[PDB]
Design a protein around this nucleic acid. Sequence first.
RNA 1: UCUCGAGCCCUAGACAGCCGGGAGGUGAGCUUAGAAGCAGCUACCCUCUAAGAAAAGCGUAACAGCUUACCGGCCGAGGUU
Lengths: 70, 29
Amino acid sequence: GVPPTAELIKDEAGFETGSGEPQEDFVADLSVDQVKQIAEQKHPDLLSYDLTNAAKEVVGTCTSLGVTIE
Amino acid sequence: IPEWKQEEVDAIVEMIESRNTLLERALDD
RNA sequence: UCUCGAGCCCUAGACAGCCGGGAGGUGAGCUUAGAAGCAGCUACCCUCUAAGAAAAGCGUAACAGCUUACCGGCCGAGGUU
């Protein structure tokens, strides 16, 4: 249904492509609140019960591309 | 006497309180 | 094929076999017209859970599909190095 993660990030990230090497080459950043919203757009695609866990899932594709958090 | 089998029994007993062998083991407590 | 010894696993059910499960984010990011476990490069993280890899081997033009891992059941006594 609702679009995939990779893209939802590249939107509120302000960039288009990832980094040749993740966690090593930080391409973009994301406030916690920003990740709190994405986790809301994917409420159906995710198995988690509480929003807390839903984040860990989303918060898993970021640092793996150079998407630090604040 | 694996440690995980012990942590499981106690883990099960914790849910009951509030592998078949492990379930039985717990129930027996 | 006979005999002697050591280590580890096992009735909290071992070894093997058979049955059932092997799931979501997500077909990871990059590269590329495309690549979705499985061309190559890099990373290899977390949910549900009794399990289930950013996938060990085949398979496809790429999917699909078939299995290993991993978990559960049936079984019941030694098994393995």
